[PDB]
A paper describes a structure:
Type IIA topoisomerases (Top2s) are essential DNA-manipulating enzymes ubiquitous in eukaryotes and bacteria. These enzymes exploit protein conformational changes driven by ATP binding and hydrolysis to direct the crossing of two DNA duplexes, leading to topological inversion of DNA crossovers. The Top2-mediated DNA topological transformation requires the temporary creation of a DNA double-strand break (DSB) on one DNA segment (the G-segment), so that another duplex strand (the T-segment) can be transported through.
We determined the structure of the binary complex formed by the DNA-binding and cleavage core of human topoisomerase 2β (hTop2βcore) and a 20-bp duplex DNA in a new crystal form, at 2.75-Å resolution, by molecular replacement. The asymmetric unit contains one protein subunit bound to a 9-bp DNA duplex, about half the length of the palindromic DNA used for the preparation of the dimeric Top2 cleavage complex. In contrast, the current structure adopts a quaternary conformation whose dimeric architecture is held solely by the interactions formed between the two C-gate regions without any direct or indirect contacts being observed between the two WHD domains. As the G-segment-binding grooves of the two monomers have moved away from each other, the continuous G-segment-binding surface that spans across the two WHD domains in the closed structure is disrupted, and a funnel-shaped trough is revealed between the two halves of the DNA-gate, effectively opening an entryway for the T-segment. This conformation may thus be taken as a crystallographic snapshot of the DNA-gate in an “open” state during the Top2 functional cycle. Similar to the structures commonly observed for the Top2 cleavage complexes with closed DNA-gate, a divalent metal ion, coordinated by the DxD di-acidic metal ion-binding motif of the TOPRIM domain near the non-scissile phosphodiester between the −1 and −2 nucleotides, was observed at the so-called “B-site” in our structure. However, rather than remaining coaxial, the helical axes of the two DNA fragments in the open form reported here are found to be offset in opposite directions by ~20°, relative to the original G-segment axis. Thus, the sliding of the two subunits against each other, plus the swinging of the two halves of DNA-gate regions away from the structural dyad of Top2, both contribute to the opening of the DNA-gate. However, as the channel’s bottom opening is narrower than the diameter of duplex DNA, further widening of this “bottleneck” region must take place for T-segment to go through.
Numbering used by the authors:
A (entry chain A), B (entry chain A): 452 to 596, 603 to 615, 625 to 702, 707 to 1111, 1135 to 1201
The structure:
Amino acid sequence: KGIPKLDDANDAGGKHSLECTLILTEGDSAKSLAVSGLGVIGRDRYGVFPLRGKILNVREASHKQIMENAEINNIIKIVGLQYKKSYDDAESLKTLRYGKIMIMTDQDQDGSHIKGLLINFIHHNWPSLLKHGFLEEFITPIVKALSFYSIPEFDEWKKIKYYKGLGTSTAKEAKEYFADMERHRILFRYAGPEDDAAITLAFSKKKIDDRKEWLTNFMEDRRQRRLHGLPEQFLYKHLTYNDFINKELILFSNSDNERSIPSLVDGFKPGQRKVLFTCFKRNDKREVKVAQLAGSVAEMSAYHHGEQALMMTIVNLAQNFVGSNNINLLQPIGQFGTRLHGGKDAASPRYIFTMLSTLARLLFPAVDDNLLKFLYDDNQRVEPEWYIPIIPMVLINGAEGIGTGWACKLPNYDAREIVNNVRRMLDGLDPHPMLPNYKNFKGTIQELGQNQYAVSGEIFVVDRNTVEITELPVRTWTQVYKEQVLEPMLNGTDKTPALISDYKEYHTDTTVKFVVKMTEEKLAQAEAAGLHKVFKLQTTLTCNSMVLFDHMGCLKKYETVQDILKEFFDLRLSYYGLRKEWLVGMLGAESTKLNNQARFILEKIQGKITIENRSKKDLIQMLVQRGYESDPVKAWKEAQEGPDFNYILNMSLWSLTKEKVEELIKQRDAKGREVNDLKRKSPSDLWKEDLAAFVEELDKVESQERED
Amino acid sequence: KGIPKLDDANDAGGKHSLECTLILTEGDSAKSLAVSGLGVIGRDRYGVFPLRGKILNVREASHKQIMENAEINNIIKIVGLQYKKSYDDAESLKTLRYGKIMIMTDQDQDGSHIKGLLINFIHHNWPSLLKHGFLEEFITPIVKALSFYSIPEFDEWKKIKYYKGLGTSTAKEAKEYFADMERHRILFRYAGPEDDAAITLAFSKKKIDDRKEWLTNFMEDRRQRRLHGLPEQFLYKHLTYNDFINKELILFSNSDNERSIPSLVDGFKPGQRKVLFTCFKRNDKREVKVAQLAGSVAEMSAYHHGEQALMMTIVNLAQNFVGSNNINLLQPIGQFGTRLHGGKDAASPRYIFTMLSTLARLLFPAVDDNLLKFLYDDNQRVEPEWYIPIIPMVLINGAEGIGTGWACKLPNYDAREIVNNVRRMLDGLDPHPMLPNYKNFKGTIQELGQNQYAVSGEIFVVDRNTVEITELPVRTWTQVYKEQVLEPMLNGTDKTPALISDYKEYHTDTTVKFVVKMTEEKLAQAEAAGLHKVFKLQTTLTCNSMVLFDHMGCLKKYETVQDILKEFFDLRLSYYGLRKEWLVGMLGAESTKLNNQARFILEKIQGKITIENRSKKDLIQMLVQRGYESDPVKAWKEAQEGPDFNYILNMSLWSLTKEKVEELIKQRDAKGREVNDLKRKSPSDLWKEDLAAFVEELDKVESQERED
DNA sequence: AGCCGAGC
DNA sequence: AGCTCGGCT
DNA sequence: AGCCGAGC
DNA sequence: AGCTCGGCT
Ligand SMILES: [Mn+2]
Ligand SMILES: [Mn+2]
Ligand SMILES: [Mn+2]
Ligand SMILES: [Mn+2]
């Protein structure tokens, strides 16, 4: 047939074609799983073809984009479909190579997404097939203990095995699935108007706001459900397209917003936060290859997606070039991308390295980890719902992402202006308004209207024939500008003749210099029309979707950055008071511990009590009879949810030496003074300390950057 | 010109061609290094072309192999050479695009090898060029502190930087090298007959035995030199081909034998031993990807070669299929290759894992590490000159390798027969003779003549038309046998008609079953001529080169395996006596330590001495005045090349509790009894213990293998 | 001519 | 990638 | 139409 | 690889 990745059913194309089934699989490992699953006998009436991934959404797409799509036309040639053909009459179905499509995907949410896009494809092009049951799915278990086809069903029911993707199952497993097909095969049924309404609601861009309402209800409902203790409702026999869209695809849509839409608190997405948690736990003193760090992240954070997406998450986190990260929390040791190509010139993750910026733990103090809520994946504690940085990182690095029904775009903001605004609010004033600010951007950004800005590079008149372009607007890449602006100006086009006579390039990996030559008259005309407009050095920047998850995990639209700043500020200063409470608890327990250590050893050297030959039971009983406390640090740590004095009896015999008692009394007095000194500090003073340290290191680091 | 990897000199092919120089580089990183080194001005008269690696040796090679060699014809087209053309007359040199070839390689030995093969190429095809100085080299530094062009020069001279390959130097470095070319450029000169004699000696297979004598002298000389303290002689101005061959290439030849020819002792090559040392130091409880283990080996063992060669070293170490390793010291967790394709079907090192066999440390006991001599790379201690296994592993896994002037081939041998021979020698008898034995090989191996054997698979007559082939001779691969034996028998050839009517394949990944169908008369004729001959189931195995490095590092040829066995036996039992000496030293120091601990604490509880408030100096002085020994373990460990009693004073206060004194007296008596019990054991009893444990685990492991 | 394997 | 190097079928 | 990025 | 998803030029 000409498609090498396809294994065609023996009876496909023959007089039995209508009884044949094409199995569309997610990935080629699923392909092999199904192939071995059917074996010799299954090969007659069952074809199997792989899909690379998410497919084209054909409902709104251009004609050229559809006609040039390799996968779509592969499925068309395999099944024998013809565009605009309706299938009712026997004469019409004589032309099909297969009578059914059985989609086999993972039992996770992205699988459901592929299911939905295939449903949308068939529903858009051939409703004649969709109404009559041309489409089926082959479900697999996500967990076993007997089999369970969704995590809520297994949780409600409650050796346990978790199945990540179809490739995890193998060998006999696959064959087992294909011996009993009554349980694993589910037919999509068309009930009526509700089905069409549901499909178009999911896959049409006219329905975006509808999707918003859709998802909103879901979120509220589930939270309300979660509040009242009602169990999660789950699927998995016939399944109507409506019930699929609203009870299954919807969880992909919500999971898509949850992974794609950052938190207001730390400005992170679950993947990024997993990466940073892993880095925090490893605490590498030396650089680590991005591929190896990626695998380590996967192990330690329980990151269940593919390695490529995570490696590029890391790369995106490390990028320091103009227009990317105002503060990069990972160091880009390697080629991580440049201003020239916009980062697309980054070297392979196998050949580049990274590690924590020395500002990372200054922005996310280690002690604050004791204030967070760490989540769990199958009894493995992984990473918190959020970190709580000393300043609103969601504003600094310009968080963005694309979900379903909502998207998020924020531009960057100067760290020092944000630090100053936090200081203003700590001193009881109102914050100043803030325009976006991009580190090392030499151009201007000026406020046009509400949430709209003009971003302009720099261009100068050198002389009558010469202009010098020293800056391009933020996110305009050097190579792209050359190809799409200066080169068309120089060579001219069909409609537009040549404006400029020549140009030359003086660039730095981090900077832009163009020297353009024009005729006298044509420069005069260009500056009459204005230089930034003619040379395309002004772009509009409009942020009307700032969508973030607040500290409750609720999606919220913020109209101004000052709202983000205030909400963050309240939360963060609350957590600073929490940090003081925790610190007086911990330091207080430590000081009591040091005090009972000192009393014990001071009485041993003073001769008040002798430990020699005392039985363990008799000694512990005597110690509790003499008033010694039990391990105040372990007791206070356990209290946050036999008597242990080991902290006293595991001390060295060196303890009773004169300089050990001396240094231990000094430690005791010093810890007491530490508790008294921190007790008199306000939480705001704690915050100001953190901010001062952060700016000291920020000046050192950025001046080292400019010197290098 | 059509070669994309080439950067051609601007003046190449023009009227200045004779003044142009083609730079042949080792690898493309060297190519880029030279490109940036010449810059804009250098590009006019200097071309640069990369070589993949070692090139074809054209002196003895087939005509087809030469005419089809891509690199050779690339250099010919680039320079403009013509085979059989002599270059003297001006008319003849009018046809060359370049006047000189400048070879730029690494300053290590393999670079010298490439230099030699280019010299051999030009000398073979065009002596007219070689006599007149057509060839130059561009040397680079191997180390800096000023620059040094060989490690012996730098050692004799003695921030220090070591240069591994040309790719380590970069940027300004390269440009520096090409600003001063008087120091870095060296011209090869043809003195006379000595040069030709030297080149042919190196590169001709008629000269193998000559090379042997050659290398022998060198080895002896250097050892003699090394014995008398005379410094190593080094090179690096003109260099004659003779002086190059005998003073430079020769060190590649010797290094090639040292890496390619295993030791008699542990049966390893430096790379393999580095791998196993790394595994021993990591002590992985879980599997590790072969790529990651490879990188870790590189870091910890100071392995200076490419990652591919090391990853395949690991793969070769893990292979358990019939005809590879009788005992695989690494576990093949993945697809590491099968009997079918001979291991060439192994999966990529990124997708497969390994770890230590549970017999690894039973064959190489950890305590024996204290008896070895660990080498050093730039102050980093890495791995021993050899390990000392409990049985001669060089016989078990069938060590082999190809150097210069010598090669090594040994077949495998049964572990249990070797263990039994060692037991025989420990009981004072002579060893039995041993034929080669391959684990899980169902065929036969029979002695023909001295060091020659017949290896035969298994074939049976089922009935008049049918024969069954259940075994192929060792190292004959299933796929290869099918393609080159059964398929030609079935399809016939131009000369030979078809002997067999059909065949079918019943194979297991680990086993071979062929059922062949023939005519009655033709089976009769085949068994008349014999079934093993007709069906190519007998191969000859001749081992007349068994070449190993003895325990002195001297190359030695062994005529029989019994010589290997005896030499190993003497060395190993010597090291068992050493192990007893070391063990009574260590256990004796431990027992003294426990005794002074017990005396101290027993006198503290008895009240004989009080430590409370005593000054550190006063206490240490009193302790040495009262007879307490100083840290016998640290003193005895230091003796193998202020007073420290910390081992007594860092004890817990729990020490003075009644059950701690009780268990400590029990530990003391138990260690004394341990010293007395091991003192009465012979070294042979130690060896027999090791052998018994090894066979217990060997039976458990191999029975688990057959069950799985 | 091809295979064996540590190297380029 | 296609090759080295020596022994051997 | 294309860009932005975590996913397939 | 070529695609999703929403906002915006
Ligand atoms: Mn999945
Ligand atoms: Mn960004
Ligand atoms: Mn090298
Ligand atoms: Mn082997």
